[PDB]
Design an enzyme around this catalytic site. Sequence first.
Site: not given
Ligand SMILES: CN(Cc1cccc(CCc2cccnc2N)c1)Cc1ccco1
Lengths: 387, 389
Positions: B36, B232
Site C-alpha cells: 500500500d 495509492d
Molecule cells: C481497500 N484495501 C484494503 C484497505 C482497507 C482499509 C485501509 C487500507 C489502507 C489505507 C487506505 C485507505 C483508503 C484509501 N487508500 C488507502 N491506502 C486498505 C484493499 C485494496 C487494495 C487495493 C485495492 O483494494
Amino acid sequence: GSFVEMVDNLRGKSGQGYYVEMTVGSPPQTLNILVDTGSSNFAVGAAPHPFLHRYYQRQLSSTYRDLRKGVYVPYKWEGELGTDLVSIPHGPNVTVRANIAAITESDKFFINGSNWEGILGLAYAEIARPDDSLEPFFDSLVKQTHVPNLFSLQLCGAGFPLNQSEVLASVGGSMIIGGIDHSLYTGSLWYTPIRREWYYEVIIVRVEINGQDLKMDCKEYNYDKSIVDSGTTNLRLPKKVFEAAVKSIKAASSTEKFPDGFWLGEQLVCWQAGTTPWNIFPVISLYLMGEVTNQSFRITILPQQYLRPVEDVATSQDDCYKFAISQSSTGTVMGAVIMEGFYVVFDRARKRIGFAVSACHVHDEFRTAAVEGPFVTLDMEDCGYNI
Amino acid sequence: GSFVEMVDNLRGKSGQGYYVEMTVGSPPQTLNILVDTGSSNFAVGAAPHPFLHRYYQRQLSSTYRDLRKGVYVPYTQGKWEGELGTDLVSIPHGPNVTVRANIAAITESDKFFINGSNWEGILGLAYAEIARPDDSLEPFFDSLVKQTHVPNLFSLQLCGAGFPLNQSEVLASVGGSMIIGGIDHSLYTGSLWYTPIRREWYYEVIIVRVEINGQDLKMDCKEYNYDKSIVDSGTTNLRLPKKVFEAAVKSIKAASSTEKFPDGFWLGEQLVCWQAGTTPWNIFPVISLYLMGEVTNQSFRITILPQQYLRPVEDVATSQDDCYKFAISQSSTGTVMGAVIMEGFYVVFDRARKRIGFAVSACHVHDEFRTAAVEGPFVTLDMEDCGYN
Ligand SMILES: CN(Cc1cccc(CCc2cccnc2N)c1)Cc1ccco1
Ligand SMILES: CN(Cc1cccc(CCc2cccnc2N)c1)Cc1ccco1
C-alpha cells in the site's frame, strides 16, 4: 395501580434471576419459577438435585398427564413432557392446563441459592423445544381464559448487595399478567414494534454514550438480532459493538483506570462505602424503532444499571460492582440489568414492546434513567439483519 | 537493470489488493502482506479473525520486542486497533536482507480484512508524516534503507488479468512485481516519464489537465488536485473530487451514449454484462491525465483505456458473459490513482530523487485498436497554480 394482586409478586436479582410463585398439579405443589422472556418452555425440576430443596412430584398429582416424549435443551437440562393444571397464586385468578417439561437431569442449570426450581419461558412457540408444536404457557393461558394477551414486567434491582436472607424477604418487582399497572412507572410509555414473533425481537437504530453517537452502521447493532431477555443478566452486545462501546465508556470514565478484568466483566471493583463515582461513568442511550414511520425514541440507562452490585470477597464495608455489559455472538441482548431501569410491556396483542422509566430504578440526585421521544429517523428498516 | 529474483513476486487483483510474501519473527512466520503506497504503517493480523487463516504470534518469536503502546487507525474503508512492537522482517522474494522494523500487531479490526483476499497484513510504503500514531514511528521502507544498502527506490507493476479470477485462479496467478531497490526494464515498454513528488507524506503529485477522448474537461486545474492527488495502490478505483467526478461522468456518458446504462452502474455499485467476447470497448473513451514534468513548463500525459477503468467481475450467475463494474468513483479526499490506474503502468517510486515515474506496463490489458500510453512533452504554464494550498 389497577392490578394490586400482582404488584410485588417477584423476588430475586439480576445475577441469579427474578422468579414468581406458581403451583402445579392436584393438590397444588408450590414452586418458585424463573421469569424468562428469552425462552418458550415451562420446565420444572422433577427429581432430587443438590441445589433444589423441592421439586415437582408427578406421582402425587391426580391431574398429571404423561405425553410420553422426551426433550433435551442444551445451553443444559433434560426432561419428560406432560401436562398438568397450573396456577399463579399472585396473578390472574385462573387455573389452566399447560405443557410441563419435568426436568430429570440437568447440568449447570440450577443455581445454588437462587431459590427457583423451574423456568417460565414467555416467548413464542417458534423457539419452543422440541419444536413449535409444544404450546407455551402464555399461549395456553390466553386460549383457555379471558386474560388479555399481554404481560408487563417491572424488575427491581436493589442498588446494593442482598445477602441470602435479604433476597428472600425483599420485593424484587412485579409481573402483571394481562395488563399494565400505572403505579410501576413514571412518564410515558413508548412502544417499539416486535419485529418477528419468536424471541421478543426489536430493532435498535442508534447508540449514544453520554450523548456521543457510536456512529456504527445500525445493522451492526442488531447483528444477528436484538432481543429483550429477562433470563440473561447482562446487557450484551455484538462483538464489534461491544468493542466500540467499551472504548467509548473507558474514554468517558478515563479519570480512573480500571483493570482489564473489570471490562471483561470477570472482576469486581470496589470503592470506600458511599463513594462510588457514578458521575465519571457515562449514560447509555439505545434508540429504538417507533411505531410511526420514520419515528424513533430512546431509552437511557445509568451506570447504576450497568454496574451490578456484588458483595466484596472480603464482605468488607466497601461498595463493589462488576461491569454488566458483555460481548455476544448471538446479537444484542437487553438482559436483566437493562430491564431494571424500565417498566417493560410485552404487548403481544399489538405486536409491540413498551418502555417507561421504572418507579424502582436505581439512580442518584443528579441523573435518572429516561424514555424520550420522538426523533426523526430514516431507513430504520435497514437496521434489521437478514441472514 | 534486471532483478529476476523479484519479478512476479506479487499476487492479487484490483478489487481486493496486491500482496507480497513477507516473514516476521524468529523463527520466521510467513504472511501475505498488502502493498500500500497510500499509508505508512506495517501492520499484521495478530489474533484470530474469521477471514484470517494465519496471523502473527508474538509469543512464538524470540526477537519480538514490545513497545508497550497501542495505535488506533480508523478509515472509512476499514478500521484496525493494534499493539506496537518491533521484530525481524524479511521479504523472501526481495532483497536478501533482514531488517528490524516496527510492527503493529492487529488485535481488533472492523471491515479491514476481507473474505478471500489472501493477505493478513498491510505494508505502508508512504512517508513517516502520515504514520500512526505520529511520525516518530519509522515506516518499514525507511528502516530498510537505513539498515541496508538497498537503494532508496521501489517500483510497482500491478497486473490486472482482464477477466475474473476465481478463488483458486487468483492464488496460482502472477499478479505482478514489486522491485525493491531498482527498476526492471522488462516490466515496461517505451520511455519512463517523471512527475515530481510535490511533498513527502502521501506520494503526492499534480495533475494539470484532464481529457476524455482528447476532449479537455476544461476545469480550473486546481479542481483536479483538491485537496491533493496521490498514487495509492491501497484502494481499487480511480477516485475523483466531487466536481471533477461529475464532469467526467457526464463526458464519459456522452462518449458512450450509443448504449444506455442504469444509474447504478455509474455509481460503481452494479455490474454490466455483455455476451462473451462482445464487450464494446470501442464505445468507451480513453482518459488522459496530464502530469507536471520535471522540466520547467513541461508536462506529460498518461492515457488509460476502458480496459483499465472497467473492472472485470464474475456475473452473479457465473454465466459465460463478460461483466464489469465502473471503477471510477467520487472522492472527498482528492484525486486517488488507485489500483485500476496502476494496472496500466509500471510505476517507479523514486524516493531518492523525489519523483514518480510512469511507463506503459508490459502487462496492461488492451485490444488491437488502442493501447495505454505515456507521452510527452507538452508545454504547460503555471502548473504550480494547479496545486492546492
Ligand atoms: C481497500 N484495501 C484494503 C484497505 C482497507 C482499509 C485501509 C487500507 C489502507 C489505507 C487506505 C485507505 C483508503 C484509501 N487508500 C488507502 N491506502 C486498505 C484493499 C485494496 C487494495 C487495493 C485495492 O483494494
Ligand atoms: C442465567 N439464568 C439461568 C438460566 C440458565 C440457562 C438457561 C436459561 C434460559 C435460556 C437462556 C439462555 C441464554 C440467554 N438467555 C436465556 N433466556 C436461564 C439466571 C438469570 C436470569 C436472569 C439473570 O440471570
